[PDB]
Each structure stands twice: as C-alpha cells, then as structure tokens.
Amino acid sequence: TPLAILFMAAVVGTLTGLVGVAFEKAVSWVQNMRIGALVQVADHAFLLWPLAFILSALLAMVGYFLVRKFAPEAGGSGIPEIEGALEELRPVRWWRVLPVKFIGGMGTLGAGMVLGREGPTVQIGGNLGRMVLDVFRMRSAEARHTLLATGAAAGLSAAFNAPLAGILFIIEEMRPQFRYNLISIKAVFTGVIMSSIVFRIFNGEAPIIEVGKLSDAPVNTLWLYLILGIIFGVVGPVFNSLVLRTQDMFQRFHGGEIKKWVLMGGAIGGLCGILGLIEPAAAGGGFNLIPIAAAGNFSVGLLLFIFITRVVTTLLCFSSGAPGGIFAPMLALGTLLGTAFGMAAAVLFPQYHLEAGTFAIAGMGALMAASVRAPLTGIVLVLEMTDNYQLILPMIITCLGATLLAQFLGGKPLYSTILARTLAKQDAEQ
Amino acid sequence: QIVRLRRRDQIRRLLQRDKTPLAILFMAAVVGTLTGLVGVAFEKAVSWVQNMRIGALVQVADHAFLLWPLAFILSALLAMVGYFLVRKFAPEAGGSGIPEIEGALEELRPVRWWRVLPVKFIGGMGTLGAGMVLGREGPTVQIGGNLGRMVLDVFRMRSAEARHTLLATGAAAGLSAAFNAPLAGILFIIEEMRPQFRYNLISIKAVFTGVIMSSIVFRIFNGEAPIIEVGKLSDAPVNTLWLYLILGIIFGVVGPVFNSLVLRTQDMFQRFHGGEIKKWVLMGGAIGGLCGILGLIEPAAAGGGFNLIPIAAAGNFSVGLLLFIFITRVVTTLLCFSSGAPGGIFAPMLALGTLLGTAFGMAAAVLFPQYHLEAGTFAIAGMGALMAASVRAPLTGIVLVLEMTDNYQLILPMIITCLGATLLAQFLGGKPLYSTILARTLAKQDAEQAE
Ligand SMILES: CCCCCCCCCCCCCCC
Ligand SMILES: CCCCCCCC
Ligand SMILES: [Cl-]
Ligand SMILES: [Cl-]
C-alpha cells in the first residue's frame, strides 16, 4: 500500500507538471495571438481600440461561460475548493473541472486579465490527483488525501517553479491542521520534485522572475522592515474585506444568472484589453514584468499610483468570479507597495544608503502573508524566486510582522474565509 | 444530518485558524531573544576554551616531549569536566539533548532547567573546547528548550499551549543559533511535531517570532559573515539528477546502519563503566584526551565537523583520502557521542554526509567525464542526507543546507539525495535516532525505578 501511494504520488506529480507546463504555454500562445493580431491592425486606431477590447472581452466571456455552465467550482482561485476536498466537505469532479479550468483560464488569463496561473494549476493538479486516484480504483483515506495533496502541491510548485514553497504551502495552509488526514508529506514531496524535474525539462535553468543580487540589510536597518510589515498588517485584512465585498457586489448585479455574469465578464475582460495597451502595469498577471522593474527604480507616486489602479484591477478580475488566481497578483501588489515604502525610506534616511530593491523583495511576500496567512510559504516562495538570502531577516520580519498584526487587527485567512462562505452558502441554499 | 453539522464545526476551525494568544506571542519573543544571547554566549565560550588550549599549547611548541603530554591532559581534563558535571549534577544534559526536549514536549520527560542550564553550558564548554567531535546544537537546542521552560515558570504560565509553544520556541531558536539558520529552526519543529499542531498546542507564528529574535541577536554579535563559505558551485543539468538518486540510495543505507552503530557503541560503553561515576569520568577523559592528540595529528578526524571540513571538501581531495577521513570520523563521532559527553551528533553528521558525498562525486565525475561533474555539487547534495536519513527530517536537512551553503541552483540535487535517502532508510527498517534514544532512555528509566 505505501509504495503504491509513493508511486502514484510520483505519477500525479509528473502529470501535474506536464499539464501545468502545458497550461502555461497554452496561455502564452492565446496571448501571443491576441498580441500578434492586435499588432496587425496597429496601423490606425479605428480598429486598434475595438479589437483590443473585443478580443479579451470575448476570451473572458468564454471563461466565465464554461464555469457558470459546466463547472461552477472552477471559478476563482480553486485553492479553497481543494482545501474543501481534503476536509471531506467538497467534491472533486475533475471530469468537468480539468477541461473547464484549463480552457477557461486559457481564456481569462489569455485575455490579459489580472489573474495568476497558480490558482488554476493548483486546482488542476488537485483534480489530477483525484482522477489518477479513480482510474486506479484506490479507495483508502491515505491514498485519497495524499494524492489530492500532491496534485495541489505539484501545481503551485509548477506555477512558480518553487519546489520548497510547494510542500510548505501544503504543510502550512492546504491541509486541515486539526485533523488526522493521513497525508504523506514524503510522498507529496516526491510528487513535487517530479513536477519540478518536468518544469526543467521544458523551460531549462532560466528562472521565472529575474532580479540581480541586491544589497545587504545591516542591522541598523531591520526596524524599518518592521514598520513596513505593520503597513501590510493593516492592508492585508482591508484587502480581504474588499475581496469579499466586491464579490458580493457582483452577486447583487447578476443575481447569479449566466446571461448577465458572462456579459460583465466580457465587460471586465475587455477593460483589461484596453488598459493592456494604455498603461499595461495596471493589467497583466503581475510579476510578468513588474517585480523585476520595481526592484530597479521608479517614481514614488508613479509607483504608488500603479499600486492603486492594480488594487482595483485585481479586485475586479478576481471578485468577478473568473478562473484565475489572487495569489500571484498579490505578490505584485506587495512588491509595488514595498518598493514605494523603501523608495521613501531612502530619502527620509540618507545615512543608511538604502535601496528600494531590498524593500521590494521584503514586501513581495508580505501582502499575501497578511491576507492568506502563509508567512512561511510567502517567505520561502520569495526566496526561491528572487534568490537573495542576504535579505532573509528583512523578509521574515516584514512577512511575519504583517501576519502578527493582521490577526491582532481582526483579519482572517483569505482562503479559509472563501471556503467558509461556500460551505455556508452550500447548506443554506439547499 | 452529520454533514450539515460537520460544516458548522468546520467553518469555526477555519475562521479561527492560527490565532495565537498575545501572552504566548509576547513571551516567545522574550524566549527567543534570551536563547540567542545564551546561545551566542555559549559559542563564544566554547571558542574561548579552545583558544586557551590551542594557544597555551603552542608555547611548548618546540618542546616535542612537553607537547604530546599536554595535548592529552588539557583535552582530557576539559572533557572530564564535562562528563563529571553531567554524571553528578544533571544526567539528562549528557548526550545530544534533543531527545529530552522531545520527551518534554510529550509529557514523558521533565525539564529541570535549574540544573541542566549551567551543567550543559559548562559541560559543553568543556567537551567541545576539548576538541571532541561534538556539535554545538545539542546544547543550544536543549538550553533553548530549558530557557523556555524557565521563563514559563517564573512568569507562571501553565496553559498547555504556552508550555508546549515556548518549549518548542526555545528549541527552534536554539537550532537556528547553532547554524544561523532561522528557516531550518522553524522547520525542524513543523516537520517533527505534526501531532503537537493537530492538537492546538503550538503555533507557527509564536515559534517564528522566537526564532527570528535569536536570529537578530546572532547578527548583532556576529555580523553578516556566514558560518561556512563554499563558492558558487556549478549548475546541475537535468541529465545529472539520476546520479543524486543513487547517492541518495547510498545514504538511505548508511543512515540506518549509522544509527545502530550509535546505539550499539552506546551499549559497549555501558557494559564498560556499568554506570559508575568514576569509570565513566575516566573513559571520558581518555576519549577526550584522544581527541587532543588527533587534534594536532590528523585534525580532520576531530573537531566539531564543519569547523573546517565541508569547505575544504568542496574544493579538492582524492577518493581514497575522503573515504579514509570518512571512516575515521565515523568511528571518531561514535566514540565522542555514544560515550555520553554533552554534545551534538547533528553537525557531526553534516560532515560525515558531506565527506561521503564528495567521495561519490569524485568517483562519479570520473566514471562519467561526459557530464563535467564537480565533486563539490555532490558534497552539498549529501551535506544533509545522512542526518535526513538518521533523524528523518529531510525537509530540515534541505533548508538547513540551502541556508549555510546558498547554492539554490542545486535545490533539485539536494531534495533528491535528501528525500531519497529518507524514503529508502525508512522503508529499509530505519527509526528516527532521537525517537529511538528517547524510547531507550525511558526503558532504562523504568528498568530501575520498577526494579
Ligand atoms: C530530457 C532528458 C530526459 C532524461 C530524464 C532524466 C530523469 C532523471 C531524474 C531522477 C529523479 C530521481 C527522483 C528521486 C525521488
Ligand atoms: C546595535 C543595536 C541596534 C539594534 C537594532 C534593532 C532593530 C530591530
Ligand atoms: Cl489563488
Ligand atoms: Cl544533536
């Protein structure tokens, strides 16, 4: 039995890596199309503005459609659903999710909306686990939860090419802490390592995000990151509040009727088509080009301006209900705000000879740490992506600080809240 | 009916997930700070006793006959100081110390901080300053654990959660103080106390708060300079990985074997002194003086371990020399640890693992010249695999290395060799060294109490 699981775990890990890489290029292409066909009519504005809006607006509707029609549970993140699956409180209908999630996400993210690939991959992988589990007629609690977990782990792993963060996210956030789930971390890790291998086979060494080697963080500077951490400690809960509000707002709008939902979906999707060409920092998955530029140099206000247009943009796309993630998007917000802070810090304290870069990094994982409450995952994730270990303290101070203050301030873990709302809404409706 | 019910109860456990009482939180910070201080204090102290020795030993440098005698005596006395203080005032302070902190977290073992704190400190200061093959984490983790319980007692916090959290926070802050590895410290806890979290007794935030405080005091007293500096090792192309899985297989076998040797040698020593304070304190001075000699003749066979090795081993040596220093240190760590001296077996394993990994590298680099392999990368890959298969904390091994080494481009090889060894060793009938020692320390506990 154990070797079987171990073996199966490894299979799910590999599959998830393939599907993941697949989705990741499948999204790039749809983007390449929309961009290569938008460069054609680029001659005159008479047909540039229209296409821009139409393409993404249409690609978005595709997404919203498939979800609302075939698989409702493929909307939004997906992580909350997988958590629900592990808790034996939510189904895993891969037969309609895998297709929907993949194609829908392909539309929505391809449209240029502000959503991440992690949400989708982690759920796809979560389901792949289940699938495999069923096409092998395995029915032990151990097998069920371990493979479901491996999928989830390997998924996030593949979304950021971050093996460590992958299991950390399972250990820290995915698995129901207060339960005997019978999940085998060693097995899950085996899956995660597989997916990482696949990732390498298809993308080589080259990391996703690429910062250089930033400066050091002398002791006499750490207090600043504490202050920076508090700022996120206040914004984190506030952000979850808005996510939940805005989510309600849309319900009142479409009442949940497909016709309407899909329509504003095209609306919201199109808005990202327009921003796409006029001030791009406002749209896009996020790190796609931002963390890197933010760790270079920018204007406090310009930086602080992008931050706000991105807050509204992410809230729209995510709350709307489209398949996609709030995770990655939050890492961008974090870097933005962290770079603004640090930008000011340098000026306000010349004696330190600071660099907004360090703060961009320090804050990269903090927003997510105050909203989702995965301090450890946030920190390690950032480490693997930016590889600047000389900033481990600033990173831990800022991220932990935000998390401490986020609870002390009334905040709740985002995923835990969204799941809560779905389990609440569930028994209620029915 | 049951599902509509399990939903109620679950949205509660969720909308209140990881929420830590402010008192514990506040104290975890105090406990972490305090542990780093006493932590770095110990490190300075051990380094001191070593300078006294090595310095007042180099004055009789030109007196060939007044050298070997001192090399023996100095280390012999110092070591004896350690063994004695342990055997007489606080027995639980002998050995690693982690298996006791582990027992404390399970209600199976008392934390007598009043005698262990000073005993372990000075005891470790002696045996380590002697030159014996012992790690400094042994003491620091136990010291940290004890400091945690102390604080807890003087402020009168009796809640099971405050108790389990600060004890664990002390342990983690201690582990990171020994290697300036914050993530590793916090991870050793997560990966080794799952049950503690299933019951809501420990909180990651609390432990993290404590660990980061010790990490800061460390920087305050030691600066940016890293414990050990390896270089920027080369990359590890996809076509290389299968090798690490093999190297991982070697460890999965050595792992369980080494653990038994640890236990068995621990027995030999037992039959010898039977338990009598003076037999023990003498065979301790012998083993300790023995290290004094190797100290100047065959230095690689002694010392804490990384104190000079995983850094020279990631540069250049020959396959035969490595295997020779390997087995030498395998027997040398056994003697020093199983004897009972206050000291860690953690860091010493990091060296056995690094050496063994360098050897495999060399062999591999030759057998497959097509890969252009640098032994160094395997040194790193294996630096944490032996401990990962003995202790069974693969995730800690990996992150610990990443933290001391800092060659993230080698994370795949690292994970493979470490997780591989662990899986295998477990499958092959292996037991967590600490769990085992704790189990045996409880067996011998009764074999007398109910005798
Ligand atoms: C593109 C070349 C294909 C070669 C694939 C080599 C795969 C080696 C991977 C070893 C992984 C060991 C995992 C152990 C847990
Ligand atoms: C040299 C003592 C400075 C202390 C700075 C502490 C910042 C958290
Ligand atoms: Cl997400
Ligand atoms: Cl130890």
Curated annotation (Swiss-Prot), chain B:
GO terms for molecular function: antiporter activity; voltage-gated chloride channel activity. A motif (Selectivity filter part_3) lies at residues 344-348. A motif (Selectivity filter part_2) lies at residues 135-139. It is found in: Cell inner membrane. Residues 59-65, 222-241, 298-318, 368-375 are periplasmic. The record marks 192 as: Mediates proton transfer from the protein to the inner aqueous phase. The chain crosses the membrane at residues 22-58, 66-89, 113-130, 137-155, 204-221, 242-270, 277-297, 319-338, 344-367, 411-427. It comes from the Bacteria. It catalyses: 2 chloride(in) + H(+)(out) = 2 chloride(out) + H(+)(in). Residues 98-105, 166-178, 179-181, 182-190, 376-390, 391-393, 394-405, 406-410 dip into the membrane without crossing it. Keywords: Antiport, Cell inner membrane, Cell membrane, Chloride, Ion transport, Membrane, Transmembrane, Transmembrane helix, Transport. A motif (Selectivity filter part_1) lies at residues 95-99. Disulfide bonds: none annotated. It holds the Pfam family Voltage_CLC. One of its GO terms (cellular component) is plasma membrane. The record marks 137 as: Mediates proton transfer from the outer aqueous phase to the interior of the protein. InterPro entries: Cl-channel_ClcA, Cl-channel_core, ClC. Chloride binds at residues 96, 345-346, 434. Residues 1-21, 106-112, 156-165, 191-203, 271-276, 339-343, 428-451 are cytoplasmic. Proton-coupled chloride transporter. Functions as antiport system and exchanges two chloride ions for 1 proton. Probably acts as an electrical shunt for an outwardly-directed proton pump that is linked to amino acid decarboxylation, as part of the extreme acid resistance (XAR) response. PANTHER family: CHLORIDE CHANNEL PROTEIN. Belongs to the chloride channel (TC 2.A.49) family. ClcA subfamily. NCBIfam families: PRK05277.1. Homodimer. This is H(+)/Cl(-) exchange transporter ClcA. It comes from Salmonella typhimurium (strain LT2 / SGSC1412 / ATCC 700720).
